[PDB]
Write a protein that binds this ligand. Structure first.
Ligand SMILES: CC(C)(COP(=O)(O)OP(=O)(O)OC[C@H]1O[C@@H](n2cnc3c(N)ncnc32)[C@H](O)[C@@H]1OP(=O)(O)O)[C@@H](O)C(=O)NCCC(=O)NCCS
Ligand SMILES: CC(C)(COP(=O)(O)OP(=O)(O)OC[C@H]1O[C@@H](n2cnc3c(N)ncnc32)[C@H](O)[C@@H]1OP(=O)(O)O)[C@@H](O)C(=O)NCCC(=O)NCCS
Ligand SMILES: OC[C@H]1O[C@H](O[C@H]2[C@H](O)[C@@H](O)[C@@H](O)O[C@@H]2CO)[C@H](O)[C@@H](O)[C@@H]1O
Ligand SMILES: OC[C@H]1O[C@H](O[C@H]2[C@H](O)[C@@H](O)[C@@H](O)O[C@@H]2CO)[C@H](O)[C@@H](O)[C@@H]1O
Ligand SMILES: [Mg+2]
Ligand SMILES: [Mg+2]
Lengths: 596, 595
């Protein structure tokens, strides 16, 4: 339910969202249409999760790299600006938002990282990465540090990894080869090894994140940081700073990945024409962009008339100099896998979990395993999106490995078991990363129940043609149970063992004739057990729950309620007398989920 | 089936087993009774394992410290020497073999560790442990080392741990609640030892054969060993002396002193032949000499022969060290003490735990005595070299999971946490007996436990019991064990778990005292556990027809589980019939299947 006659906009919390809300107010005053701007955490991961249910914002702002994934899952409207409107924006910006022959967002601004330094602590910034250990030694003696920047997001480390030859996907003939991944070559290993040595030699701390680095720079405790244009506003309020070219590595320029902040329209919006009017006639004007830019700088904007003014800011000149040395990101759907793979490699190598060589070998494998599918998202409650995450795969990608801690669980297991175990736990680690949790082994405990990291709950499922994981923050979600089954009739004799007479009477009457209601019931019973057992530590048989279904008007998705016939007491907390879930049949599979 | 009219004797492979076999040949020549001497590995653990089934050797040789644990489980005959025979041995040696007022073994000889040195490399051995790092540095400059000894067995490191105040159980009786392995003296000793290793004066991997080889090849100037070691050194080119162990912080090293002793298996049908062999053949001047010439015994218990041995300066040094140490207790808690200290010395030496963490865990582990033999009574004695076990009837306080295991029970209820932790402590005790270092035991397919490479096993836990049995995979395909309380089954369960023919035939095969319904259930569960690792498929209660026999003794017997479904395995032959054993004791049913 996206509300008709209003706009909801998502944009990242480090950007000028208050400025954008001012453009929103102007729009309301002219047209009567209320504009609500929100900035949820991890919105780049939450958007598909909610847009899959037909929910979410009318308009989503993010760097262009994520948009191909959204388009592949059918989540974006096609954009068709007219001739005069296209001519108002730089051509390379339209190319950024073009995917498979269609425009999938409006380009807004060009972002690239620069080196930002405190001129009073450091009147001459370092030209090379290699001189930074020496500089940190000198600064540490004065009670300061040379450099702090966000080590938790690979965006900030990539310029160094790419400098001496790291790359994401090989480009040729206007086309990216997803089988030629450049994260494990000599150049990438050299850059990452330099970073890990900085940490080992106590020149940086592996836990430094965005807020830590920003606070340290803006209070004058560190001489340098690496950040984008959005960051300048907070500094300006604190420091006499310069924005300059990133240091070289092995004498080669650092090569940041360049983003074009872009605005896409939800394919489920009933407000597409209003969204287009807003973007074309209110935002992408000098006045609109100025409103946002004065809140937090956008970078070099896509609109030529205003970029001609901003280009005179020497901070923007520095921005474009670093952008020229770097590369525009791909927008292919495999980008989200690339990023997960590099995030994880960097974090594991920085913390000691893996050697650089192991961390990057694994990234090269993982960057293959794209997870932009949304089948299970369709059975999750959008209202709790901030505390849930998911990932799914429809095959077993080659070369995935279990974590060393997990390996004993499948050491004497059959091949199909080894594959489903490894693949589903990869999904689990992708989902956990969405909630901000680093890589952890997922072991098996009481009656085979999966063992989650502190503060997390979840569920796993694997059948023919599917592996999926859903994870939740335990401070908001008591338990999760999910289950996938092939959408086939049940084998002989199974329906009677798994069902009650009333279910057999009611369901064929309630469900569309096209659906294998027998298998759907069985899938829901299994999800019920998975949600149940972590909280009760007791058996629940198929005959111990009576499940009733309802069907949405689409005919392919709905709700169910499982009423428990035995003692529903839990070890702590409210009893599980009933459990509510959702079901969906799509792509040959049945998905069910319960979030308690 | 211990054979009547023959004697089988077990003694450790570091002792004079050939000499003992010579006394055996003389017996056979006089009496017509054949004597077979064997030296199984880990025989101190293997004896109770096989004797629990009424099998094993007629006579068991070991230091007296193990014998209380054997007596407690009813494994030894009381011995009946007359007063004239007792006056032939030293009184304090009889004291070592008296348990709850009864004599439970014949004493043979007094053993203590001494410092053994190469007179050509080191004509003035060091009086103190503190000089050894400097000596080593000097010798290393000549391609040599100062000292090597077995760091794998806590017997050898104990003298240093106890030097400055470590003790086992505080002594008219031993207080098992006052354990001294974690006081300041013990930590000082063990810290010294770990420091030797950190400073590259010794290596954590050094074991008995490694140290022996090095000393007898003249590569190291000193070792620490008992009298049994002397004959191998005689045969080598090394010119050696035997002397007082070095002091530590000015206090003498205090070895734990063993009395080698010979017990009689309570299940032996040859008790009078054993008595004759021991009293009239072995415990004579000539018998002890035969053994002593093979590998020296130490200061023997027989006064007439000790009169001769006491003139040897090596024996004088043995006794000097023995008097500075202490005779070991014979209380059944000794084997837990040794397991605790073993684990601690190995963990600290290797750096897996700090000295303080290691010794604090040892103080805890010294409480968890495992001398029970209920699951041992259902294990096949023919496979004893490749099986080990341990069981507990309670949850000892303060046991913890391995860190790798902790997530498996992080949100589990108290009773689950306890049973999980205690059973895995049992599993680690069993793995130790097979020479496998401590490992986590995780849970895999359908909850199956996850064993170290090359091992198989099974776990069980019910009210009043935790037990583990582990086997070497190259000899044992699968193990399934199961414990249940010996109670009638809940209403309706018998019909759910049994087949009609079982309900018809089983009551006729079992004595009136038994809950046959429960024993059937327990065997079915054991069958699944042996089955699943090999097949990875379900086996239902109606999918095996189990038949039973009972031994004449009435509380143990055999069963056969016949698989009624397809028996295909992941490898090897299909499962067809699985033979097991069952036992009922102390209100519990135990079952085991070893494939
Ligand atoms: C456990 C069970 C529900 C699994 O469902 P399934 O559809 O066969 O298999 P899926 O692949 O969807 O689920 C397998 C995953 O479930 C999870 N699971 C297993 N036991 C579990 C438990 N006790 N609690 C929670 N989750 C559990 C595991 O993560 C497992 O994957 P892993 O072994 O790779 O970790 C099913 O095998 C079963 O045993 N059902 C009996 C109980 C039941 O369904 N009762 C109905 C109540 S109305
Ligand atoms: C699994 C089962 C056999 C365990 O037996 P139990 O007597 O109830 O419980 P016990 O305490 O003796 O045994 C529990 C241990 O068995 C072991 N175990 C559990 N699942 C197992 C499997 N699939 N394969 C092998 N061993 C398994 C585990 O080590 C477990 O302890 P842990 O969880 O601490 O690691 C029983 O719970 C069960 O599910 N039985 C159904 C199948 C069956 O018995 N079929 C009859 C065949 S004729
Ligand atoms: O760290 C990987 C991350 O990098 C990029 O995200 C940038 C974003 O482009 C900027 O607008 C700014 O917000 O910081 C982000 C890094 O934290 C990619 O756009 C994104 O897909 C990727 O996950
Ligand atoms: O290492 C612990 C071990 O010490 C003693 O074992 C001795 C034994 O007494 C000697 O006769 C000789 O064989 O060396 C053994 C050490 O390897 C205890 O008697 C024994 O119970 C204990 O486990
Ligand atoms: Mg399923
Ligand atoms: Mg049981």
């Amino acid at each position: 339910k996206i509300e008709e006659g209003k706009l909801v906009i998502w944009i990242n919390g480090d950007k000028g969202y208050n400025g954008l809300a001012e453009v929103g107010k102007k729009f309301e005053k002219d047209t009567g249409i209320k504009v609500t701007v929100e900035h949820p955490d991890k919105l780049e991961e939450k958007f598909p999760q909610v847009a899959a249910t037909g929910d979410g914002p009318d308009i989503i702002f993010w760097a262009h790299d994520r948009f191909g994934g959204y388009a592949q899952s059918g989540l974006l409207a096609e954009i068709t600006p007219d001739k005069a409107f296209q001519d108002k924006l730089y051509p390379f910006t339209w190319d950024a938002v073009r995917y498979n022959g269609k425009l999938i967002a409006y380009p807004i601004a060009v972002e690239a990282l620069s080196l930002i330094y405190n001129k009073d602590l450091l009147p001459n910034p370092p030209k090379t990465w290699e001189e930074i250990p020496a500089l940190d030694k000198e600064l540490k003696a004065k009670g300061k540090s040379a450099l702090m920047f966000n080590l938790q997001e690979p965006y900030f480390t990539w310029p160094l990894i790419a400098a001496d030859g790291g790359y994401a996907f090989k480009y040729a003939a206007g086309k990216y080869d997803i089988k030629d991944v450049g994260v494990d070559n000599a150049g990438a290993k050299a850059g990452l090894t330099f970073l890990v040595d900085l940490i080992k030699n106590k020149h940086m701390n592996a836990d430094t994140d965005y807020s830590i680095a920003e606070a340290a720079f803006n209070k004058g405790e560190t001489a340098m940081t690496i950040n984008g244009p959005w960051a300048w506003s907070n500094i300006d309020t604190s420091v006499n700073y310069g924005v300059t070219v990133l240091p070289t590595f092995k004498g080669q320029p650092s090569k940041p990945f360049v983003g074009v902040l872009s605005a896409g329209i939800n394919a489920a919006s009933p407000n597409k024409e209003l969204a287009k009017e807003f973007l074309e006639n209110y935002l992408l004007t000098d006045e609109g962009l100025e409103a946002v830019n004065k809140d937090k700088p956008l970078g070099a904007v896509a609109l030529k008339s205003y970029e001609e003014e901003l280009a005179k800011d020497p901070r923007i000149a520095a921005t474009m100099e670093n952008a020229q040395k770097g590369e525009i990101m791909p927008n292919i759907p495999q980008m989200s896998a690339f990023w997960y793979a590099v995030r994880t490699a960097v974090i594991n190598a920085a913390s000691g979990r893996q050697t650089v060589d192991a961390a990057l070998a694994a990234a090269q494998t993982n960057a293959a395993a794209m997870t932009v599918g949304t089948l299970v998202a369709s059975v999750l409650p959008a209202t709790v999106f901030e505390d849930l995450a998911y990932a799914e795969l429809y095959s077993d990608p080659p070369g995935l490995t279990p974590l060393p801690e997990e390996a004993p669980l499948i050491a004497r297991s059959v091949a199909k078991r080894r594959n489903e175990f490894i693949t589903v736990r990869h999904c689990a680690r992708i989902a956990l990363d969405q909630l901000g949790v680093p890589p952890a082994p997922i072991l098996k405990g009481d009656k085979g129940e999966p063992c989650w990291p502190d503060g997390m709950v979840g569920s796993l499922t694997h059948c023919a043609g599917y592996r999926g994981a859903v994870v939740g923050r335990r401070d908001a979600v008591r338990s999760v149970g999910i289950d996938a089954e092939p959408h086939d009739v049940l084998p002989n004799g199974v329906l009677d063992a798994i069902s009650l007479p009333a279910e057999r009477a009611d369901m064929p009457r309630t469900m569309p004739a096209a659906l294998h209601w027998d298998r759907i019931l069985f899938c829901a019973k299994e999800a019920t057990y998975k949600a149940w057992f972590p909280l009760t530590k007791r058996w629940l048989g198929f005959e111990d729950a009576h499940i009733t279904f309802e069907t949405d008007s689409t005919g392919w998705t709905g709700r169910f309620v499982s009423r428990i016939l035995i003692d529903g007491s839990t070890l702590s907390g409210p009893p599980l007398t009933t459990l509510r879930g959702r079901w969906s049949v799509e792509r040959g599979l049945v998905l069910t989920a319960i979030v308690l």
